[PDB]
Amino acid sequence: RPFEFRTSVVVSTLLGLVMALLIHFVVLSSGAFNWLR
Amino acid sequence: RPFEFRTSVVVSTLLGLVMALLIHFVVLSSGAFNWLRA
Amino acid sequence: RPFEFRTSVVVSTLLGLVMALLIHFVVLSSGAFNWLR
Amino acid sequence: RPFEFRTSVVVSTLLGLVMALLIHFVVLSSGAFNWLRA
Amino acid sequence: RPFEFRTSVVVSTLLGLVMALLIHFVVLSSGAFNWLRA
Amino acid sequence: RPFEFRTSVVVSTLLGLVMALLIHFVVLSSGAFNWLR
Amino acid sequence: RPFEFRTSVVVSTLLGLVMALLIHFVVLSSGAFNWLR
Amino acid sequence: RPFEFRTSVVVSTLLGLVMALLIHFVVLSSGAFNWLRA
Amino acid sequence: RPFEFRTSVVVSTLLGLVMALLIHFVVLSSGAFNWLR
Amino acid sequence: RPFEFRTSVVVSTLLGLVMALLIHFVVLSSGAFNWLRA
Amino acid sequence: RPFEFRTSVVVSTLLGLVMALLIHFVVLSSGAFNWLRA
Amino acid sequence: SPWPVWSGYALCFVPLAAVILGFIIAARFTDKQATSAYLRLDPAKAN
Amino acid sequence: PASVGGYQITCATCHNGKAAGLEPYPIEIMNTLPNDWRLPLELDYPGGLVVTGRKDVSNHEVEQNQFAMYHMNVSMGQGCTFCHNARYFPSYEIAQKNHSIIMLQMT
Amino acid sequence: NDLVPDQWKPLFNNAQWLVHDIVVKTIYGGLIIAVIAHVLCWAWTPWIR
Amino acid sequence: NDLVPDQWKPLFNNAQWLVHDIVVKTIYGGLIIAVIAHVLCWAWTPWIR
Amino acid sequence: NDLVPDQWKPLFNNAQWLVHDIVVKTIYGGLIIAVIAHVLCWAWTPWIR
Amino acid sequence: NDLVPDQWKPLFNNAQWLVHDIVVKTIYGGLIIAVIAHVLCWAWTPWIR
Amino acid sequence: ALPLPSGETLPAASAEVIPFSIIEEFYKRPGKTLAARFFGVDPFDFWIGRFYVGLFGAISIIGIILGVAFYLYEGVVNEGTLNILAMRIEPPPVSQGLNVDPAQPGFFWFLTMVAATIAFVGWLLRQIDISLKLDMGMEVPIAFGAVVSSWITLQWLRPIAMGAWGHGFPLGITHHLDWVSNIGYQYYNFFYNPFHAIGITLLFASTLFLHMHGSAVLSEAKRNISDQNIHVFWRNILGYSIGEIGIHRVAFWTGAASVLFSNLCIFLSGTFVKDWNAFWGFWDKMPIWNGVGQGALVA
Amino acid sequence: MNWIVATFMLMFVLVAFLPLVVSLAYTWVTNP
Amino acid sequence: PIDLHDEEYRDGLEGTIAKPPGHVGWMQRLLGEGQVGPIYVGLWGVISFITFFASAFIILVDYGRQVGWNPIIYLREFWNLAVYPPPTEYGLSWNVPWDKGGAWLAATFFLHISVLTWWARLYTRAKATGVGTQLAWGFASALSLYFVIYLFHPLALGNWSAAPGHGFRAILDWTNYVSIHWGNFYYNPFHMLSIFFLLGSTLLLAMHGATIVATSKWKSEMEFTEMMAEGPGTQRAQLFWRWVMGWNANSYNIHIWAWWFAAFTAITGAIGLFLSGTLVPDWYAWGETAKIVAPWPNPDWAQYVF
Ligand code: BCL
Ligand code: BCL
Ligand code: BCL
Ligand code: BCL
Ligand code: BCL
Ligand code: BCL
Ligand code: BCL
Ligand code: BCL
Ligand code: BCL
Ligand code: HEM
Ligand SMILES: [Fe+3]
């Protein structure tokens, strides 16, 4: 098969974690929600 | 066949992700949409 | 044959993508269309 | 024979592309044609 | 025989192209012909 | 023979071209002939 | 023989050409002859 | 023998040429002879 | 077994020591206790 | 045996000596005790 | 035995010498005793 | 405003974490390949 | 300010023991600069030599600024940090940069 | 390559055909969502003017 | 090269013919779309004047 | 070199003749378009004066 | 080394004797010319005074 | 199938598939370190895990732990910043001189700098011991000693020669760059320093040589070639092939020389020179051209 | 400036240059 | 299928010159080999030669014109002579006087052609010798940095003055001026990454050279043979680096490490240089807004005064 299961899981997990952290930090820094003072 | 399936898939995925990130950055940096506190 | 199909496909795709990106950026930076403010 | 068809094609194509790019840049940067807001 | 036809053709073509480009550049920079700019 | 025909031809051609270009550049830069404005 | 004809010819020709160029440039730059304006 | 004729000839000729050029340049820069427009 | 006793002991001891040092330093830095002048 | 006796002795001695040095230096520098010229 | 006598001798002597040097240096640097004009 | 800007976030802290993780992963896999079993000359015979 | 002192300007400040033939820009101080460079005394010095992030200037204006700054260095003997902090040149924190502004206006 | 059609037998494999079908359906759904998003954004704030 | 035409047999393979045909249709669709886009952009704001 | 003419047999191969014809046709079309573009540009605004 | 004198045989080859003679003659001529030039320049302008 | 070191699996020399355990056990040979020769015995002549611990390994580890503790204490306490990119660990003021007082600020900078020096020297000596146990040369110690001498020039020799001891660098992330910038602009045109230029040349040459060697070795790893293809390739381009043993010698020499010239220029700029633009005022006054020009072309 | 201490430190730096020179000399002396 | 004798001893164009190899002697004693050997010339390299020397001739003739054609002053001021680009006015125009930036444009064009033809030469000879083409892509990664410096950065800024002036002293001035213009590159994150990769490259080169030279008594420098089966020298090197820092590699991974260090250096430098002017006009202000700038209220400034 073209791709193996481990590669797909690794890429998906890394992308999800990176995007989640980036989005939380961008939203916190934007100062448009009144979150954490 | 001239090209393998893996090469096509990898190139397409990388190009799509990079283009999406670049377009989001360019659109949101212009400040012409009033998104997330102007 | 002088040239293989693969090399021609690769060169054409790269040239087209580079030209598209260059022309879009030149037009946007010219500031003569009222696009994205 | 003196030269292969491959080499002639490659050199001709590259020379044409380079000359087209250079001539376009020189003509448009001269500011003598009023193209994209003068 | 001292030289091959390939070497002569390559050297002549390169010399002609370089000389033409240099002459065009010098004539454009001199600004003595009223061409491509006031 | 100490030298071959190829080397002599190459050296003579290079020397002639270099001298001609240098002489034209010096004459143009001197500004004593009214050539090219 | 300590030296070949080829080496002697090469050294003499290079030295003569360099000396002629240097002398012409010095004479032209000194501005003591009224040559080339 | 300690040295070959070729090395002696080369060293002597180079030393003579450099000394002659240096002395001529120093005398020209000294401005003490009224030579070549003072 | 996936992990040895020695590796677990080493990791746990290092983590505990580093955490104790960090917590003491942070509490001293905060200046909220009136401790050690 | 998970660990050797000499390794345990050496590690314990190093940790104790380092801790004693650090604590004496911190207490001396804090200047909260009036020891060795305040 | 876990440790040899001569190894213990070397370690103890070196540690004692280092500690003595450190204590004299620190006491001198403190400048609290009027020793060597201090 | 106790927080950095988004551009600071990306340009500084994405490359730094990427470099750290990449270095650790590359070192781990290099060590794995190095310590594997493959052809070698016998040290007893080899001098 | 009174911190600099209370020194005044007199004949010897500019003449230095010569009746005439004064030499501003002597050859010994024109070491690294072009031999025909002079101070740009036709500008407004509160903002005359600003280049940082302007985006309407380029390396030529920076070169002119550097010529002026090295002249200011040579006229004293304290180096480029005498009036500046090298981490951020636009900063006004060393207190000899306002003195330099007053000196430039005087010149 | 039993499941591959006759036309695409020299190009595709029995395993790659299924993954290609998955990718094609994913791109179709993505295009539908992109068109809907673009229409909504145009209704919200035009960008050409 | 059984499916390849007689004229172009020395230059093409059987599997390369299909990929070439796909590229040709892609280029033709792109050219039509680009012509339309240029016409609308000219109707919106000329860049030569 | 069955299809190559008699004059150019020592210089050309059967596969290369077809690519040469394609290149020549492309060059002739490009030359025609370039001539047209130059004529329109001159009609718009002369560059020699 | 037939032409090389008896004293100079351990140092010189038969071929280097002639080149050495040429070099010696050239050096003698150069020294004579240098003496003449120095006398002429001194008669023109003394450089010690 | 026989697994190759590169990673190939080539079906079937005197080679054989040997686990790393046999090699690791064979080459131990304890009892040949530098401390054993001096004292007749090494107090720590064993391995803890994969590391070998010797007499100087203990000194290095003590220095490392103490230096890290002091660094964290100056930056978490006494500054109250809580982040590492805004810490600013300063030496004592220039007015204080060459003396150290625990009461005055800047004492923990002294402690950290001394601990770091001890750790660096201990690491160098440990490398010497490990090299001596394996019957190898002493090349890596020479390179690392060049680096350590570069450290000692910046933190010991220059402050002592200038005599005020405030002339050493703060140990702060993003903050030693402030010191570099201010020192470089104090002696304006630090580009015009000759040894700085030589060091930059050597650094760039080192990077280029590393890239060339990596490319050349990687271009022949997994191919059926005769081992002389690389030599023909390197003679056809640039007309010279250094060989197998010359490239590593050149790499080591260039790497050491760059740091040596850099520490030379920093020390010379500290004390014997004040301005690097005035250093070149001797050039145009030499009596071969001081009288040949007019106007702007004079001098 | 105390010129004795500065010259001493300069001598230490030039000493630090020495090991690479010794390595070069060793490589030249061997491989005849 | 490749005959090395043919690839090294052909005649004419598509062949080699300097066919009778030379010998230097001292390079054989110090470096282990001293054959000058023949050099290939194959129409990728004649173009490079001609274009590079055309550019050099233009620059040297402009140097001569700038000093009034005085050879003595030419030797006097050689190292502080330059051919600068056009001034900031008339940003990207080519209708410029020859002494006001006309020669710079022509020389730069010929230099671009020369470097591209050199890359083609490298690629073709790598293909013709049977080895891989890694060197071509490394050179591509350095040409990326070069083209950002000379072509792509002056474009998108609107002037030719954002490029170096073709001189020994002009590159240093360009570096200083670009640093002063856009704040401080000490606070440019991509400058930091490039410095990290550069210093790592130097460190790795020194380590590898010392390691191989130390174990050269067992023929550890024959990389091609060690990749087939390890020998005593490679085993000793692995054991040394395992006992020093706890992990090591083999004689194949270190080359990948070095290649990627150099490539990352070039790429990060190019990206940082491009990003410097177009998006962040001031790097210190950005660093202050990003909380990566240390507070500095009460300096001790006596260090920095004479
Ligand atoms: C600026 C005005 C609007 C806006 C306008 C638009 C518009 C208009 C569109 C989007 C689109 C998208 N927007 Mg937006 N968007 C806004 C604000 C946001 C915000 C935010 C926090 O504010 C977020 C998080 C998003 C997020 C997104 C994404 C959901 C989506 C693009 C996905 C993508 O990368 O496809 C590209 C991704 C890929 C090519 C990779 C796919 C990979 C798959 C998913 C997994 C494969 C795993 C497998 C193992 C891989 C195998 C190969 C490997 C090489 C081994 N938008 C604002 C408010 N947005 C687009 C959309 O709807 O797309 C459907 C779109 O057209
Ligand atoms: C506050 C409003 C903000 C915003 C804030 C956020 C934040 C904050 C986040 C998103 C996330 C996302 N946003 Mg939103 N978002 C906005 C506007 C948009 C817009 C838009 C056009 O306006 C779009 C299209 C999106 C789109 C998206 C998606 C790409 C994504 C959620 C789906 C997903 O991938 O789930 C797939 C996700 C998962 C499957 C996660 C599953 C995790 C499991 C359950 C474990 C959780 C952790 C837990 C502690 C584990 C404990 C046990 C141990 C494992 C043993 N956002 C606005 C501007 N959005 C989230 C995301 O995933 O980003 C990458 C996210 O973090
Ligand atoms: C506007 C008037 C300007 C000017 C602007 C330009 C510009 C701009 C260009 C030229 C070009 C040229 N100019 Mg003009 N030129 C001027 C004045 C002159 C004068 C003169 C007064 O003496 C002369 C002698 C020339 C001479 C020339 C030729 C060298 C050349 C056009 C013919 C040619 O080579 O066709 C041979 C050309 C071809 C065979 C090309 C064919 C290309 C095919 C059609 C594909 C094109 C690309 C396209 C995107 C492909 C799409 C599909 C994908 C492949 C899938 N110009 C004035 C100053 N000129 C053009 C050129 O080619 O320069 C190198 C060019 O770019
Ligand atoms: C405008 C008046 C200017 C001036 C402007 C120029 C310019 C501009 C040029 C010359 C050139 C030349 N000039 Mg004039 N020249 C001036 C005054 C002079 C004086 C003088 C003493 O006054 C002299 C002696 C010369 C002499 C010369 C010759 C050296 C040369 C023309 C002959 C030649 O080499 O043809 C040999 C040339 C050829 C055989 C060219 C053949 C090209 C083929 C046909 C292809 C053309 C391109 C085409 C698009 C290709 C299409 C197909 C694709 C390839 C697929 N000039 C004045 C100052 N001169 C030209 C030159 O250097 O040419 C090398 C040149 O470019
Ligand atoms: C300043 C006042 C005058 C002026 C005064 C003069 C005078 C006076 C003379 C010239 C001469 C020449 N001038 Mg002028 N000239 C002026 C302005 C110009 C302008 C211009 C743009 O304005 C141009 C283009 C020229 C051009 C020229 C040339 C036609 C010619 C020098 C040729 C040369 O290089 O020989 C040197 C060339 C070579 C050594 C190379 C020859 C190569 C051959 C032809 C081709 C084959 C090469 C072969 C294959 C190589 C084989 C070996 C390889 C290694 C493989 N002039 C002005 C108007 N000019 C000279 C002349 O008449 O020459 C006949 C001359 O004496
Ligand atoms: C105008 C008066 C100037 C001056 C201007 C010059 C210039 C200008 C030159 C000399 C040269 C020389 N000068 Mg004078 N010189 C002056 C004062 C002096 C004084 C003095 C004490 O005052 C002295 C001792 C000299 C001495 C000398 C000699 C070293 C030399 C001439 C002899 C020679 O080498 O012949 C041997 C020379 C040859 C054998 C030349 C043979 C050349 C062949 C025939 C080729 C000629 C070119 C031809 C175009 C080739 C065509 C075909 C192609 C090859 C295909 N000069 C004053 C200040 N002098 C010339 C020289 O060569 O210096 C190195 C020189 O160029
Ligand atoms: C004008 C008065 C100046 C001065 C100007 C010069 C200049 C100018 C020069 C000397 C040189 C010399 N000077 Mg005086 N000199 C002065 C005062 C002194 C005083 C003094 C105490 O006052 C002393 C001791 C000297 C001493 C000397 C000698 C070191 C030397 C001449 C001897 C020599 O080497 O001949 C041996 C010389 C030769 C063998 C040269 C032979 C060259 C051959 C003949 C070729 C000549 C060129 C010819 C064209 C070649 C043609 C053929 C082609 C090659 C095929 N000078 C004053 C201050 N002096 C000359 C010298 O050679 O310096 C190194 C020199 O150039
Ligand atoms: C003063 C009140 C401060 C504070 C100050 C501290 C300090 C200071 C420390 C802790 C530590 C801890 N804190 Mg508290 N802490 C506070 C508020 C909290 C809150 C909260 C939500 O409010 C929580 C959840 C915690 C939770 C915790 C735990 C994680 C931990 C203690 C248990 C543990 O792990 O033991 C596990 C540890 C052990 C089992 C160690 C056993 C060691 C043995 C007994 C040997 C000791 C050394 C020995 C004498 C040396 C000589 C040996 C020779 C052989 C003679 N703290 C407030 C803000 N906290 C301590 C800690 O250990 O953190 C890691 C610590 O140092
Ligand atoms: C002045 C009051 C200071 C302070 C000053 C110090 C100092 C100073 C030290 C300690 C040390 C310690 N402090 Mg207290 N300490 C304070 C407040 C506290 C508080 C608190 C809640 O307030 C706590 C919990 C502690 C707790 C502790 C322990 C971790 C430790 C003492 C027990 C120990 O290790 O026994 C186990 C100890 C041993 C088994 C040591 C045995 C040593 C043998 C006998 C050799 C002795 C040396 C002798 C010269 C050897 C000669 C050999 C020749 C061959 C003859 N301190 C205040 C702020 N504390 C000491 C320590 O050990 O730190 C690491 C230490 O040095
Ligand atoms: C030392 C060579 C030196 C440098 C370098 C330098 C730089 C510099 C810059 C980049 C600016 C302008 C930056 C901005 O955006 O404002 C600038 C401006 C001033 N400087 Fe300066 N400077 C150097 C040297 C010196 C010295 C020794 C002094 C004090 C005599 C000095 C002073 C000033 C002043 C005043 C200005 C303001 C210029 C203006 O506002 O027009 N500089 N310097
Ligand atoms: Fe290697």
Numbering used by the authors:
A (entry chain J), C (entry chain F), F (entry chain 9), G (entry chain 7), I (entry chain P): 4 to 40
B (entry chain H), D (entry chain D), E (entry chain A), H (entry chain 5), J (entry chain R), K (entry chain T): 4 to 41
L (entry chain Z): 12 to 58
M (entry chain C): 161 to 267
N (entry chain I), O (entry chain G), P (entry chain E), Q (entry chain 6): 7 to 55
R (entry chain L): 7 to 18, 29 to 315
S (entry chain Y): 1 to 32
T (entry chain M): 335 to 640
Per the authors:
Roseiflexus (R.) castenholzii is a chlorosome-less filamentous anoxygenic photosynthetic bacterium. It contains only one LH, which forms an unusual RC-LH complex. The 15 LHαβ heterodimers formed an opened elliptical ring surrounding the RC, which contained L, M, and cyt c subunits; the long and short axes were 112 Å and 103 Å, respectively, and a tetraheme binding domain of cyt c protruded into the periplasmic space. Each LHαβ non-covalently bound two B880s and one B800 BChl on the periplasmic and cytoplasmic sides.
To investigate the LH-bound Car numbers and its correlation with the light intensities, we anaerobically cultured R. castenholzii cells under the light intensity (32 μmol m–2 s–1) used for obtaining the reported 4.1 Å RC-LH structure, and also a high and a low light intensity at 180 μmol m–2 s–1 and 2 μmol m–2 s–1, respectively. We here determined cryo-EM structures of native RC-LH (nRC-LH) complexes purified from R. castenholzii cells grown under high (180 μmol m–2 s–1), medium (32 μmol m–2 s–1), and low (2 μmol m–2 s–1) illuminations at 2.8 Å, 3.1 Å, and 2.9 Å resolutions, respectively. The nRC-LH complexes purified from cells under high, medium, and low illuminations showed the same Car absorption spectrum, indicating the pigments content was not affected by light intensities. Superposition of the high illumination model with that of medium and low illumination gave root mean square deviation of 1.753 Å and 1.765 Å, respectively, indicating these three structures share the same architecture, and light intensities did not affect the conformation of the nRC-LH structures. In particular, the LH ring bound 15 KγCint, 14 KγCext Cars, and an additional KγC that inserted between the LHαβ1 and c-TM in all three structures, indicating both Car compositions and assembly in the nRC-LH were not affected by light intensities. (A, B) The structural models of the interior keto-γ-carotenes (KγCint), exterior keto-γ-carotenes (KγCext), and a KγC at the LH ring opening in the nRC-LH complexes obtained at low (A) and medium (B) illuminations were fitted in the electron microscopy (EM) density map.
